[PDB]
Amino acid sequence: DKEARRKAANILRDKFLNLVEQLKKGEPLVMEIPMLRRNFLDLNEAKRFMQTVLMASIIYDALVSDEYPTIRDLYYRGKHSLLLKSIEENTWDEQKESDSVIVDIEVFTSLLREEMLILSKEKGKVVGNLRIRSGNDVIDLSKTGHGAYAIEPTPDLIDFIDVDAEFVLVVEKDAVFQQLHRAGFWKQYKSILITSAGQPDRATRRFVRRLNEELKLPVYILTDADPYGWYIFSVFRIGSISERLATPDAKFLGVSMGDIFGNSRKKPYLSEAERKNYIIKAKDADIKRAEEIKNYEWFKTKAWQEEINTFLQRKAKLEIEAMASKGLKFLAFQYIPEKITNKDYIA
Amino acid sequence: DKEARRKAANILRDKFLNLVEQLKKGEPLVMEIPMLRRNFLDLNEAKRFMQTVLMASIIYDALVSDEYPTIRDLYYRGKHSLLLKSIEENTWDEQKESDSVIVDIEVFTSLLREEMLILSKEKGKVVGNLRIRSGNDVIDLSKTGHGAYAIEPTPDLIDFIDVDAEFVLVVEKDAVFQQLHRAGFWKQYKSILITSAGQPDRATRRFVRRLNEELKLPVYILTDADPYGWYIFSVFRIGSISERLATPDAKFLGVSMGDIFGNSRKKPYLSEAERKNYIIKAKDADIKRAEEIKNYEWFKTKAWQEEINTFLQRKAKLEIEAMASKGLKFLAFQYIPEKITNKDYIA
Amino acid sequence: EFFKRNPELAGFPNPARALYQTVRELIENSLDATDVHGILPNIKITIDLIDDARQIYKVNVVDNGIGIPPQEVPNAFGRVLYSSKYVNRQTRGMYGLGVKAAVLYSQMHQDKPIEIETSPVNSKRIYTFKLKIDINKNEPIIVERGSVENTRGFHGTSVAISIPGDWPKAKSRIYEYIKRTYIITPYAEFIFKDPEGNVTYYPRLTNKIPKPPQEVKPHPYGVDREEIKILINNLKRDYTIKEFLVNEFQSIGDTTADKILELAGLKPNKKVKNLTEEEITRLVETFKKDEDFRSPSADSLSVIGEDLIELGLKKIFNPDFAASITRKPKAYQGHPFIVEAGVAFGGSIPVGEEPIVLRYANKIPLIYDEKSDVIWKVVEELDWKRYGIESDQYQMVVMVHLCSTKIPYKSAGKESIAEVENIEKEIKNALMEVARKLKQYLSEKRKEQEAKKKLLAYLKYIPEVSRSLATFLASGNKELVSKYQNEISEGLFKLISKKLDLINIE
Amino acid sequence: EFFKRNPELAGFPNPARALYQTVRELIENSLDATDVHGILPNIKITIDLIDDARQIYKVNVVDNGIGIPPQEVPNAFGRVLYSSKYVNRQTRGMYGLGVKAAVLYSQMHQDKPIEIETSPVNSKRIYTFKLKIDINKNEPIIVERGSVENTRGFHGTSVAISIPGDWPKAKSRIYEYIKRTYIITPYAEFIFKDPEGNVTYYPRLTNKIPKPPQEVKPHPYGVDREEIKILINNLKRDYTIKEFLVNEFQSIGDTTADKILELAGLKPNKKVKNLTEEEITRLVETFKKDEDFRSPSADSLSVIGEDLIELGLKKIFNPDFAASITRKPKAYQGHPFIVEAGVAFGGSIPVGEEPIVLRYANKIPLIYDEKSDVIWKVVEELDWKRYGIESDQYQMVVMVHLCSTKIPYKSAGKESIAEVENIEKEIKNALMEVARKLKQYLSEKRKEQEAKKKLLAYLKYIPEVSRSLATFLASGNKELVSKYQNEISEGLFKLISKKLDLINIE
Ligand SMILES: C[C@@H]1C[C@H]2O[C@@H]2/C=C\C=C\C(=O)Cc2c(Cl)c(O)cc(O)c2C(=O)O1
Ligand SMILES: C[C@@H]1C[C@H]2O[C@@H]2/C=C\C=C\C(=O)Cc2c(Cl)c(O)cc(O)c2C(=O)O1
């Protein structure tokens, strides 16, 4: 009784079968990889081929055969035949290898794993004034007890209906999420509140840039002082460790250096006292990472720079908990609202 | 408009305030820690005291003040006063320290963090023919799209209503869960299917042993060949790294050694061929762990032993994916059903 | 006679060791010429080097003591004394040849005289001598004798003797003499000038000079054939045996005596000069056996003092604690004896793995043979843990004095004491009677450090549990500061359960 | 005359080196007595030790060659040859004293005769001799002369000479002679029996004996005063100068000659016997200058062969490849010359850091002085990388032959070739014309290994993409096995785009 689902399971095959098919037995063909052709008639390249045109069919077959393949489930088709040649080697040897072959196909076609149905392994809750149909149900995201809905690793077959908010807020620590949630932030200041859980997964992403893109909702996110926190953010405006389906122009909301120290222009949020003991001093293995990023072509651009070296300079960071340990009331009806309306953040 | 919630926020205080109160200024008192009294009038013990009777009040205050504290939020009350003594030290120095002081209180009272409201950091999905009220909503766990409900780190204020199944199945790999789920296992063989996500959290637990205890539902769980997989299990019948609110008599369902090799009594589940290449050979840093557990007082008991050394003996393990890569149909309407009705598992 | 070919026996084995000897012979004497007659002594000791080729030195002692009656000058230095005429009052000084040997060794290897000067108490002039000796027929030859005028209120005795020795070989050992004599004799003022030109001055730190020793009548249980004879042929009148057994010995009253005559079986009213060789012995037997006498009175003895000790070893070690003890007198073979003992601890004393042991016999230090001493035994034998000492290395010093008219020496004049049991036991206990004191002070050190250890920590911990426990009372933010204090001080006092103190640290 | 006091110059410096000489003198000759007259030679070489005290040996060569016309026996061994009468056909053998020197050295240090035997082709009996010599007046004395019966079809020449030497010092160097002569002359059969009792037999490996060398008329540009004289006084009739300038030299036709008479300025029809000392020279000048003659014909030369070489160094090194080359003949100072060259590689040849160089002048090996050779230069000078060689260590061997009637030797008879430029260049190229045969074979080795490298890998990869690409066609599980093969072989053939082969490997 499957629907918008048996949509893709079709646009998949036909708009694929055709592209990988080349046969054309007039003259010797090759694939084109735009990011570099791969001639089957090479040496260094010979093996790289049989690997693509395999891990591919494995997909296309498991595709019409109504299966739901996980990436590893697919790695485990290394060695597919009995031995024809008695060399008196393996198809692929290490998952890493198999994966790359994916990503290559993934380009040749234009279709991202999740669209070919290879369903992977996703986490990341969400909650808010939002109503979707997923598969055969419509589940309302307000009415959720203290729990929370957790997206489906295929978040592209998921229809929006009624919405009610002005901004999406992406928080990184599951523990704090449970806090913002059991006060009621997302209802008081109409919003949708979603957490990743640390490193953002491959499709807690897609959800986000879909909110931001199809519903015109602005996205603020928040984590720790450290270079760690700057990273989370990085991923959210591109996709883990250098397609174009992750959201740029997301917004960084604190915790800011000046958040803890101030400017001659603007008051600090931390008491001089609390600060001496909440601040965890900077190990030098940290100051490395900073100086590596301070260089990334999408930090270099802004006066995002400003808030980097200020750190390179005060050698100091704090955990988000610390701040919230001031007590939800503050974190709820002061920090966010103040900062947000205040235009205190980076863009 | 809070209810079964303003329940606890009361049974908390009164059945607490009283216990920690001792004042009784007749003669010099102490606390009793059954797992060993702690005399405030000692030396080695002096500091251990002010630590308990602090991290305690911090709880009791934040308790009537309608806050929702996370463990760390609480650690960040190290140093609470200005210096009275010019030693020309800190309250607590490392989260590890603070934590223990919790667990201690936790006993003195009889109440588990989650019951005092300290809400922690709770991740583990669930799905099935089950209906609960949580807080102010009733959310049905069948009607869930491809998503799935994610329990609340306070899973003790959560009422059951209509149930419909005969066993709960606890799977360890989120990726495989998404598979069992989008075929419909839990509906075909009426069940509730929940995954942890690796190491089981402190309250994806409580949920389970509450299903098993209050609804009389039998619990089968499955993971990888390795000593890793045996561990997951371990936790599930006690609680990470040596109260009595984790479930014993849970059930281990494969993947079994004989699962991959057979017995002269009973046929094996993989082809001889697939084996040569799916089995990942045993590193010696592994055979250690095994010989460590083969000793744990709750493995030693059973002929759980049998299936330990068989491994100590064939130096071999496989990943759950491997098996599933045989293709859901098999994993769905053969593996589980066969094993389960078959009494193929350990108890 | 004997010292002529067997030198090493009386303490002159070789050039070097002889220097040390002569020095401790002159001091020994010079004191007993002052502090025993009740004057604060001012001794000066200078050694000079007057010839490099042959290694000849000039030992020189100058006191403010009484001095020799002029005519007895020769019969003190030149005459060679056979024996050590049985002793009747405590003195300094081993053998019975003493200062005489020094002059004898001086005429054997070098050709210079012995310059001497004396001037008795309340004397007219200063009588000067310069003596050499005739060794073959025992009689001193006067080279020079004269007298000048006395610049008032002067009395003293200057002795100057030249001998061959080895300064560098015995240096570090002589310095130990002066030093260690100074300790147990702080009522004195010493100056020492070595052949190099190094001066040392140790100043009088008080003037409580102890009671001196008193001469006393011989005691029965400790005399025999030889003596009795010389007590008799040394008389002046016709004593009877009676008188003689009573007015000549310690411990012999009318009825107490008569019974001795019943034993030896002798008539009571018989002339004394009329005693055969055998009759005597038949007496000296019953002497040896008779059961109940009294104790050999110790008024012939002399003590350092349960304080001069303290001062002595305080003003030179500067410890963190000191203590001493003087026992009641016991008795050995017709003679009395007492043991004194002390210990000093901590402070400036050098940290080492074992204690330092200073030995004292009759108000003189013993330096050589500390290893074969009845004392070196006890104080190494003693279990120092049953008395406080926790550590491996520690700074302890131990002083043990032994005095009597009859000091048992272990071997042929080798500077250490013999293992006489009855003595060894009074030496032990004496140490125990201090050792359980040192333990005391070092038991109140852990105590005094234990308070400031707690009472310090608590001042930090009673405000916290105070506030905390108060929040539990009133939930409303008003009592916070009221409930606070009314149990802060409430708490505080519940602490003077164990120890009482009011302390403000700011 | 000269060899009497200056021995070392013709190659007899000392006992040992002389042994080696005598040996290579007898072989040298014995060959030129067979292979030049067209018989497969069977030489036997035995050295014996007949006296230990004085170190005397007995070199012995026995062939199946022609032999000496009996009467010319003495005038071959005893007579001392002044000069080396200008050469007109290639021969083996340096100087102009050769085998004569051997017998001369033999009569200087030992007292035994020279046993000789000969028997001409188609001979009646065997004529035996046993000769000694008179050194002072140059004439041989016959000690013994006789003859016996010939056991049919026999012809040969047995020479037996005794000399003093040092076997052990020159052993390892003689063995190199035989060996290395064997290589370039495999149409022969050699046996060698050393003084110890070691036998060695190298067997004939074929019988393609090369063309022998032909005698030929002297060439103008390379003759002078001395010769012209002896061409004249060696005549029989009255030649005129004309005839004489034509029928007596290479290169001199009617019109070609007349112009020489225009130069030297001589009447053409003049008696020859009537030529003054100066007239001659005025001729030998114009000889030296005249521009265009022809080439000194090389029908007087003789070659190994672009094959006997191959075989020779194949049947003894057993390599993985061989090649040789014989050049066209060039010309030098009135004489002709050719350079042959060869190389062998791999297989059995010993792995070492540098190549082995065998030198050959006029069909004889050169052993001594390989370091000062015009050849040892080129082949060390040559850049072996511009020809394949990748490795540091490798197994290569190189053979360079040089032959002419006028071999330029560098120093006073020291067994190595002179750096005549025009020669050195034809020696080079010759090596290049082989060396670039080496690069070829080692270019078809990477080729042959490149096929089995691909064509092997593909057989593994064309079934997989085959199946895979077939699943894409029909989705239904029926064509799986039909589409499969109809493009497996379809694929397979698209591969014979590059290389053609049908291969079954099981
Ligand atoms: C009469 C005095 C005091 C006597 O009571 C002292 C005991 C023994 C002395 C014995 C002597 O031989 C005299 C003597 C010597 Cl040897 C000496 O080196 C230094 C001295 O000062 C005296 C001395 O002055 O003796
Ligand atoms: C007449 C023949 C053939 C001559 O053409 C050969 C050229 C030179 C020979 C010179 C000789 O001295 C004769 C000779 C020697 Cl020495 C010898 O060791 C071995 C031989 O077989 C011959 C020989 O038989 O000579």
> With the C-alpha atoms ordered C2, C8, C14, C17, is the resulting torsion angle positive or negative?
negative
Beta bridge partner(s), residue A131 = A140
Whether residues A231 and A290 fall in one domain: yes
Whether residues C143 and C79 fall in one domain: yes
- Residues 6+ away with beta carbon under 8 Å from D99: D25, D26, D29, D76, D77, D159
CB burial class (10 A; 0-12, 13-18, 19+) of residue D87?
Answer: middle
Cβ pair D472:A91 closer than 8 A: no
Whether residues D286 and D301 fall in one domain: no
Whether residues A47 and A76 fall in one domain: yes
* d(C-alpha C229, C-alpha C233), whole Å: 6
* d(C-alpha A172, C-alpha A324), whole Å: 13
Residue C164: closest CA among C108, C115, C97, C113: C108
> With the C-alpha atoms ordered B323, B326, B327, B331, is the resulting torsion angle positive or negative?
negative
**How many CA atoms within 13 Å lie on the side-chain side of C502?**
1
* DSSP codes, C30-52: HHTTTTTTT-----EEEEEEEET
Whether residues A132 and A116 fall in one domain: no
Whether residues C184 and C257 fall in one domain: no
Beta bridge partner(s), residue D322 = D344
Dihedrals phi, psi of B162, to nearest 5 degrees? -100, 135
Whether residues A1 and A23 fall in one domain: yes
Checking phi first, is residue B110 left (phi over 0); if not, alpha (psi -120 to 50) or beta?
A: left
State the angle between helix axes of A306-314 and A284-293 in degrees (0 to 180), rounded to the nearest 10.
Answer: 170
Tell me the C-alpha to C-alpha distance, in Å, between residue C238 and each of C241, C243, C276, D259.
Answer: 10, 10, 16, 184
Residue D191: closest CA among D73, D72, D105, D62: D62
Whether residues C13 and C112 fall in one domain: yes
Whether A76 sits among the annotated catalytic residues: the reply is yes
Specify the CATH number for the domain of residue D438: 3.30.230.10
Beta bridge partner(s), residue D129 = D116, D145
Beta bridge partner(s), residue C345 = C321, C396
Where are the extended beta strands (E) located within C292-424? 321-326, 330-332, 335-345, 356-361, 365-366, 396-404
3-state secondary structure string, chain B?
CCCHHHHHHHHCCHHHHHHHCCCCCCCCCEEECCCCEEECCCCCCHHHHHHHHHHCHHHHHHHHCCCCCCHHHHHCCCCCCCCCCCCCCCCCCCHHHHHHHHHHHHHHHCCCHHHHCCCCCCCCCEEECEEEEECCEEEECCCCCCCCECCCCCCCCEEEEEECCCCEEEECCHHHHHHHHCCCHHHHCCCEEEECCCCCCCCHHHHHHHHHHHCCCCEEEECCCCHHHHHHHHHHCCCCCCCCCCCCCCEECCCCHHHHHCCCCCCCCCCHHHHHHHCEECCHHHHHHHHHHCCCCCCCCCCCCHHHHHHHHHCEECCHHHHHCCCHHHHHHHHHHHHHHHCCCEC
* d(C-alpha C16, C-alpha C19), whole Å: 5
Q: How many residues does chain D have?
A: 506
- Which stretch of DSSP H or E encloses residue D20? helix D15-31
- Which residue pairs from B84-87 have beta carbons closer than 8 angstroms and sit at least 24 positions apart in sequence? B84/C459, B84/C460, B84/C463, B85/C459, B85/C460, B85/C505, B86/C505, B86/C506
- Residues 6+ away with beta carbon under 8 Å from B82: none
With beta carbons less than 8 A apart as the criterion, state whether A79 and B277 touch. yes
Question: For A197, which residue in chain B has the nearest alpha carbon?
Answer: B123
- Residues 6+ away with beta carbon under 8 Å from D152: none
* d(C-alpha C332, C-alpha C420), whole Å: 9
Domain region containing B46: 1-121
With beta carbons less than 8 A apart as the criterion, state whether C397 and C344 touch. yes
With beta carbons less than 8 A apart as the criterion, state whether B151 and B139 touch. no
Whether residues B170 and B302 fall in one domain: yes
Whether residues D326 and D229 fall in one domain: no
- Residue with token string 């120092």: C384
Whether residues B189 and B338 fall in one domain: yes
Residue A46: closest CA among D452, D485, D462, D496: D462
* d(C-alpha D430, C-alpha D400), whole Å: 9
Whether residues B93 and B139 fall in one domain: no
C350 DSSP 8-state letter: P
* DSSP codes, C296-332: --STT-----TTHHHHHTTTTT--SEEEEEEPPPEEE
Total tally of structural domains belonging to chain D: 3
Q: Which residues of B touch A325 (CB under 8 A)?
A: 72-77
Cβ pair A86:D505 closer than 8 A: yes
Whether residues A333 and A184 fall in one domain: yes
Tell me the C-alpha to C-alpha distance, in Å, between residue D2 and each of B274, D74, D76, D86.
Answer: 96, 21, 19, 20
D56 DSSP 8-state letter: E
Strand, helix or coil for residue C262: helix
Residues 104-143 of B with CB under 8 A from A: 119-123, 125, 132-137, 139, 143
Q: How far apart are the first and last CA of chain C?
A: 81
With beta carbons less than 8 A apart as the criterion, state whether A165 and A216 touch. no
Whether residues D87 and D169 fall in one domain: yes
Total tally of structural domains belonging to chain B: 2
* d(C-alpha D36, C-alpha C320), whole Å: 124
**Domain edge (last residue) among A121, A146, A161:** A121
Cα C360 to its chain centre, rounded Å, is: 4
Whether residues D343 and D397 fall in one domain: yes
State the CB neighbour count (10 A cutoff) for residue B35. 6
Q: Which ligand is nearest to the CA of C156?
A: 1
Strand, helix or coil for residue A96: helix
Structure tokens at A92: 């692929």
Instruction: Evaluate: CB of C68 within 6 angstroms of ligand 1.
Output: yes
Cβ pair B147:A151 closer than 8 A: yes
Whether residues C393 and C324 fall in one domain: yes
Residue-wise over C279-291: b if at least 16 C-beta within 10 A, else e? ebeebbebbeebe
**Domain edge (last residue) among A75, A101, A121:** A121
Whether residues C389 and C465 fall in one domain: yes
Whether residues B216 and B74 fall in one domain: no
DSSP H helices, D70-156, are 74-77, 98-109
Residue C430: closest CA among C360, C342, C345: C342
Tell me the C-alpha to C-alpha distance, in Å, between residue B215 and each of A9, B337, C175, D67.
Answer: 39, 22, 98, 127
Tell me the C-alpha to C-alpha distance, in Å, between residue C30 and each of C10, C46, C61.
Answer: 20, 14, 8
Q: How far apart are the first and last CA of chain D?
A: 81
* d(C-alpha C245, C-alpha C248), whole Å: 6
Q: Which of B76, B149, B335, B345 is catalytic?
A: B76
* d(C-alpha A205, C-alpha A224), whole Å: 20
Instruction: Evaluate: CB of D400 within 6 angstroms of ligand 2.
Output: no
CB burial class (10 A; 0-12, 13-18, 19+) of residue D92?
Answer: buried
With beta carbons less than 8 A apart as the criterion, state whether D293 and D220 touch. yes
Task: For strands B192-195 and B158-163, give the pairing.
Answer: unpaired
**Domain edge (last residue) among D216, D232, D247:** D216
**Domain edge (last residue) among B121, B136, B166:** B121
Q: Which of B10, B13, B22, B23 to probe the C interface (max C CBs under 10 A)?
A: B23
Specify the CATH number for the domain of residue B14: 1.10.10.10
State the CB neighbour count (10 A cutoff) for residue A262. 14
With beta carbons less than 8 A apart as the criterion, state whether D365 and D359 touch. yes
Q: Which residues of C touch B101 (CB under 8 A)?
A: none
Whether residues B128 and B6 fall in one domain: no
Residue nearest to atom 1 of ligand 2 (CA): D68
* d(C-alpha B30, C-alpha B20), whole Å: 10
State the angle between helix axes of B284-293 and B227-236 in degrees (0 to 180), rounded to the nearest 10.
Answer: 30
Whether residues A112 and A240 fall in one domain: no
Specify the CATH number for the domain of residue C229: 1.10.8.50
Beta bridge partner(s), residue B346 = B252
Cα B251 to its chain centre, rounded Å, is: 15
Whether residues D328 and D435 fall in one domain: yes
Residue B12: closest CA among B141, B154, B150: B154
Cα B153 to its chain centre, rounded Å, is: 11
Strand, helix or coil for residue A64: helix
Whether residues D228 and D181 fall in one domain: no
Tell me the C-alpha to C-alpha distance, in Å, between residue B67 and each of A331, A335, B59, B60, B156.
Answer: 11, 16, 10, 10, 18
- Which stretch of DSSP H or E encloses residue C145? strand C139-149
Specify the CATH number for the domain of residue A156: 3.40.1360.10
With beta carbons less than 8 A apart as the criterion, state whether C110 and C165 touch. no
Residue A65: closest CA among C345, D475, B266, D97: D475
With beta carbons less than 8 A apart as the criterion, state whether B212 and B146 touch. no
Strand, helix or coil for residue C62: strand
**Domain edge (last residue) among D216, D231, D264:** D216
**How many CA atoms within 13 Å lie on the side-chain side of C23?**
28
Whether residues A60 and A86 fall in one domain: yes
State the angle between helix axes of A46-55 and A95-109 in degrees (0 to 180), rounded to the nearest 10.
Answer: 80
Cβ pair C457:B43 closer than 8 A: yes
* d(C-alpha C484, C-alpha C462), whole Å: 11
**Domain edge (last residue) among C262, C294, C326:** C294
Whether residues D311 and D446 fall in one domain: yes
Report which residue type is found at D486.
N
Distance from CA of C445 to the nearest CA of B (A): 18
- Which stretch of DSSP H or E encloses residue C348? none
Sheet of A137-140, strand order: A137-140, A130-134, A158-163
Report which residue type is found at D430.
A
With beta carbons less than 8 A apart as the criterion, state whether C161 and C132 touch. no
Report resolution (Å) to 1 decimal: 3.6
* d(C-alpha A304, C-alpha A184), whole Å: 32
Tell me the C-alpha to C-alpha distance, in Å, between residue D133 and each of B103, B336, C10, D22, D101.
Answer: 127, 118, 116, 18, 12
* d(C-alpha A290, C-alpha A305), whole Å: 11
Dihedrals phi, psi of C201, to nearest 5 degrees? -130, 120
Structure tokens at C81: 């004394």
Question: For A83, which residue in chain D has the nearest alpha carbon?
Answer: D460
Domain region containing D79: 1-216
D220 DSSP 8-state letter: G
Dihedrals phi, psi of D358, to nearest 5 degrees? -95, 125
Structure-derived torsion over alpha carbons of residues A283, A288, A290, A296, reported in degrees to the nearest 10: -170
Measured at the alpha carbon of residue D393, what is the angle toward residues D392 and D394, in degrees to the nearest 5? 120
Specify the CATH number for the domain of residue C136: 3.30.565.10
For ligand 1, the distance from its centroid to the CA atom of residue C26, given in whole angstroms, is: 8
Structure tokens at C100: 């005489």
Q: Which ligand is nearest to the CA of C63?
A: 1
With beta carbons less than 8 A apart as the criterion, state whether A281 and A316 touch. yes
Structure tokens at A84: 């024809």
3-state secondary structure string, D343-363?
EEECCCCCCECCCEEEEEECC
State the CB neighbour count (10 A cutoff) for residue D242. 18
A331 DSSP 8-state letter: I
Residue A321: closest CA among A225, A227, A228: A225
Q: Which residues of B touch A145 (CB under 8 A)?
A: 132-137, 139, 152, 158
Report which residue type is found at A248.
P
* DSSP codes, D314-327: TTTT--SEEEEEEP
Residue C287: closest CA among C256, C264, C258: C264
Dihedrals phi, psi of C407, to nearest 5 degrees? -75, 115
State the angle between helix axes of A57-64 and D464-471 in degrees (0 to 180), rounded to the nearest 10.
Answer: 30
Dihedrals phi, psi of D322, to nearest 5 degrees? -140, 155
